[PDB]
């Protein structure tokens, strides 16, 4: 077995301290290991961003856009987490394909067909005036030109929503396959617990502040290091087992999912900080049917 004692995960991509060269022939490696385990990424980081506002004190009272946003079942739950917290926020779910029926019949939440583009950016900024708005994107087209045109289609979610903060999806062209070199929003890169065994993907989270709109530029030498950073954490750091990590389950995304969850708030007191991650973790399995 592949055992190890770990203060903390990596919560962030700057965090991870060692890399590896890409080998090709992982991609032929089974990429989950659980059901519904992307609706599963999806809940932890989301819960985990929006936690943060909370925290911030910049959640209540605003509109979370979410683009990308269906099937999106994952997402009744945090709806139903902060509904139950006391906590006003109205969602407004985008995507061209259906939502999961769940989220239907809730006068908090309005879910739209539609597919986005810069024009209806502009309408939905002028309908949501004056609220504040919470921007999340899960759009999917992937080639390099798709995710160029992805990112580009982002950054132009924020200058056009002009949101509080944006938590958007984010994945580096290959090296192999670079085009030209682009700028993405300045945020944090928050690392996936449960994403695909062999994915590069994490979410860039933003906090806006005074009327500036910071951005970072990346090119191939960048695109080369986030290849070797995420190899090395998903073959390496991802299959470890945290022998001194005291949890019924003693997976390293176990272990990083407990981090970002214990940071969540909830409305019963617990003893201690095993308890409520135990109690959070079991809510969000039993919700999403997850053995
Ligand atoms: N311009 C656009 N506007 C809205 N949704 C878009 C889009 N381009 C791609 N998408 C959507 O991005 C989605 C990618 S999958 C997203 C999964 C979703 N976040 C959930 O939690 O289940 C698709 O449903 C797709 O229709």
Sequence with gaps: ?????????FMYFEEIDNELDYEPESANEVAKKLPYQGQL????????????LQRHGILDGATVVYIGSAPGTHIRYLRDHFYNLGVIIKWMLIDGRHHDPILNGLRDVTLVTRFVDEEYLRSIKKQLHPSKIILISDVRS???AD?????????????????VASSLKWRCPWPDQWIKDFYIPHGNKMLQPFAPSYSAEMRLLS??????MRLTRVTKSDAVN???????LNKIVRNKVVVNFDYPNQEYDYFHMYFMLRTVYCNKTFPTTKAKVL???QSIFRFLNIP
């Design 279 to 281: 109690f959070l973790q």
């Design 142 to 144: 992937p080639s390099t």
């Design 207 to 212: 906090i806006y502040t005074g009327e500036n």
């Design 1 to 9: 077995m592949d055992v190890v004692s770990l203060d903390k995960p």
């Design 226 to 232: 986030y290849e070797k950073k995420m190899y090395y």
């Design 147 to 163: 995710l160029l045109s992805n990112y580009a289609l982002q950054n132009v979610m924020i200058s056009i929503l002009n949101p």
């Design 41 to 52: 990424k999806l809940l932890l980081g989301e819960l985990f961003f929006l936690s943060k």
